[PDB]
Design a protein around this ligand. Structure first.
Ligand SMILES: Nc1nc2c(ncn2[C@H]2C[C@H](O)[C@@H](COP(=O)(O)NP(=O)(O)OP(=O)(O)O)O2)c(=O)[nH]1
Ligand SMILES: [Mg+2]
Ligand SMILES: [Mg+2]
Length: 430
DNA sequence: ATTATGACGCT
DNA sequence: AGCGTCAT
C-alpha cells in the first residue's frame, strides 16, 4: 500500500544511434543516403559479414550476421560499405571517433553511462527537477514532444502512424496533473522534453539520427527505446508496465535472452514477463539465486535499481581477430606476427587514449582460442602492462601463452590458434 | 567461416 | 586470477 515502493524515483533515458555504422558511412558518402545499405567486415568469404543495416535494407530482410552474398540475394540493389582494414585486421577507429562525437553532446545535458559504441544511459532526475522549477506549473505542449510515443496509448475510443502517435500523446498530456511537481508521470514527460532536445542537438551537430527510451530505470528505458525505432523516442510509464509485460516474451528483456531466460521459461512453465508476478521473491530466489531472484521479482513489476554509472569512457581497450577453419595459425612465426599486428593497433589506441583521457592501462589480458574449442576463450592469461610498446606487449603475450603449444617441434604450433585477443585493462589516472 | 569487441558475474 | 554469460 502506502509503503510499497514503486520504483518511480528516477528519470532514466537510453539513447541508441539508429543503424550506427551505416549512418557513419552515409554521412561520409552521400551516395549511400536514403538507400538500402549495410556495413560489412572483410570481403573474400561470402562477400563479408554484415554488422549494420539501414532501415530501407531491413525492409528486404537484410540483417546483422548475414553474409553479404546472401543479403544481395534478398536485396540485389543493396549498397555496401566495408570496415577499414589495417595491419591485416578490421579497424573500427572511424566508428569509435563518431561515438565520441555523440557522447560528448549527450554529456552536455547530464552525466552519461556509455553502454556501448552507440548507446548511453542518462540520469535526468536532477535536470527534470530544474526544468520543472523553470516551467512554474505551466503545462507541456505537444509541440515540445514532436517525435515522442506514449507506450500503451491511445486506448479506448484513426489510421496513419503519425495520427496514432499524436492521439496517444494528446491522451497522455490531457491526463497530466501538472500541478504536482512530484508526479512521476509529469517527471517522465519533462524528461522526454529534454530527450527531444538532446536528440535534436545530436542530429544538428553530427548528422546522426537516434532513438531513445524514457522511463524510471535502465531496463525499461532500453526496452522503450526499441519500441519505435528509427528516429523516434518512447515514454514507458510505470502504469504502462502491466499491459506491456503481459505479452512481452521473457527473452526481450536485457540479460534474459540467454540460458537464464530459457531456464525461467522452462522451470516456471511461463512465456511472458508479466507471468513472473505470481511467484514470491523467495520462490524466484530458490530457482535463480538471491540476486537474480530479487532482480526478477522487482523487474516484472517494472522496478529496477541499477544506477546510471558516471562513465563516459570504455573500461577496457581491446584488439581481437579470429582465424577460422584453414587460416588458423599453426607456426610460431605466424602467432608472433599476428600478436605483433594486434599489439601495434593496441599501442596506437592506447597512446591516443592516454593523450585524450589522462589515464594509463596497467594490465594486459591475452586470450586465445584453439582449434576445436567451441568456447569464446580457450585460455586467458594476464601480465603487467608497464609501457605502451607493441613489441614489448606482443613478446609478453607470447611469453604468457607459449606453454599452450602442444607441438614438441618448436617451429609448429599445435593445436592451431583460431583466435587472438589482447585487452588493456585496469586504468589509473596519469 | 558470423566477427569484433565490451561489460560484468562467479568462484 | 581465470572462466562463463550476455550483448550485438
Ligand atoms: N564489430 C562488430 N560490430 C558490431 C556488431 N554488432 C553490432 N556492431 C556495431 C554496428 C552497429 O551499427 C553498432 C551499434 O549496435 P546496435 O545498436 O545493436 N545496431 P544499430 O545501431 O546498427 O541499429 P539499431 O538502429 O537497431 O540500433 O555496433 C558485431 O557483431 N561486431
Ligand atoms: Mg543502435
Ligand atoms: Mg546499441
Amino acid at each position: 500500500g502506502p509503503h510499497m515502493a514503486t520504483g518511480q524515483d528516477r528519470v532514466v533515458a537510453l539513447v541508441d544511434m539508429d543503424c550506427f555504422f551505416v549512418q557513419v558511412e552515409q554521412r561520409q558518402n552521400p551516395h549511400l543516403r536514403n538507400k538500402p545499405c549495410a556495413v560489412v567486415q572483410y570481403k573474400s568469404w561470402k562477400g563479408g559479414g554484415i554488422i549494420a543495416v539501414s532501415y530501407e535494407a531491413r525492409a528486404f530482410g537484410v540483417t546483422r550476421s548475414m553474409w553479404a552474398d546472401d543479403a544481395k540475394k534478398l536485396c540485389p540493389d543493396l549498397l555496401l560499405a566495408q570496415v577499414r582494414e589495417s595491419r591485416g585486421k578490421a579497424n573500427l577507429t572511424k566508428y569509435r571517433e563518431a561515438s565520441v562525437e555523440v557522447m560528448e553532446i549527450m554529456s552536455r545535458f547530464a552525466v552519461i553511462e556509455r553502454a556501448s559504441i552507440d548507446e548511453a544511459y542518462v540520469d535526468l532526475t536532477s535536470a527534470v527537477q530544474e526544468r520543472l522549477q523553470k516551467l512554474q506549473g505551466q503545462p507541456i505542449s505537444a509541440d515540445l514532444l514532436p517525435s515522442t510515443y506514449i507506450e500503451g496509448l491511445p486506448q479506448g475510443p484513426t489510421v496513419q502512424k503519425e495520427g496514432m502517435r499524436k492521439q496517444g500523446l494528446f491522451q497522455w498530456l490531457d491526463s497530466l496533473q501538472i500541478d504536482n511537481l512530484t508526479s512521476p508521470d509529469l517527471q517522465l514527460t519533462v524528461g522526454a522534453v529534454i530527450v527531444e532536445e538532446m536528440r535534436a542537438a545530436i542530429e544538428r551537430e553530427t548528422g546522426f539520427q537516434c532513438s531513445a527510451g524514457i522511463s524510471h530505470n535502465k531496463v525499461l528505458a532500453k526496452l522503450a527505446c526499441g519500441l519505435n525505432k528509427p528516429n523516434r523516442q518512447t515514454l514507458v510509464s510505470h502504469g504502462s508496465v502491466p499491459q506491456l509485460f503481459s505479452q512481452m516474451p521473457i527473452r526481450k528483456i536485457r540479460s534474459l535472452g540467454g540460458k537464464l531466460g530459457a531456464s525461467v521459461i522452462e522451470i516456471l512453465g511461463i512465456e511472458y514477463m508479466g507471468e513472473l508476478t505470481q511467484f514470491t521473491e523467495s520462490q524466484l530466489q530458490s530457482h535463480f539465486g538471491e540476486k537474480n531472484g530479487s532482480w526478477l521479482y522487482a523487474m516484472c513489476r517494472g522496478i529496477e535499481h541499477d544506477p546510471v554509472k558516471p562513465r563516459q569512457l570504455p573500461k577496457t581497450i581491446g584488439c581481437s581477430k579470429n582465424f577460422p577453419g584453414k587460416t588458423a595459425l599453426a607456426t610460431r612465426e605466424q602467432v608472433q606476427w599476428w600478436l605483433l599486428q594486434l599489439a601495434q593497433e593496441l599501442e596506437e589506441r592506447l597512446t591516443k587514449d592516454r593523450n585524450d583521457n589522462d589515464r594509463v592501462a596497467t594490465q594486459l589480458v591475452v586470450s586465445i582460442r584453439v582449434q576445436g574449442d567451441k568456447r569464446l576463450s580457450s585460455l586467458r592469461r594476464c601480465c603487467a602492462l608497464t609501457r605502451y610498446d607493441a613489441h614489448k606487449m606482443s613478446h609478453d603475450a607470447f611469453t604468457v601463452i607459449k606453454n599452450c603449444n602442444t607441438s614438441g617441434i618448436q617451429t609448429e604450433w599445435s593445436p592451431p590458434l583460431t583466435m587472438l585477443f589482447l585487452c588493456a585493462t585496469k586504468f589509473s589516472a596519469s
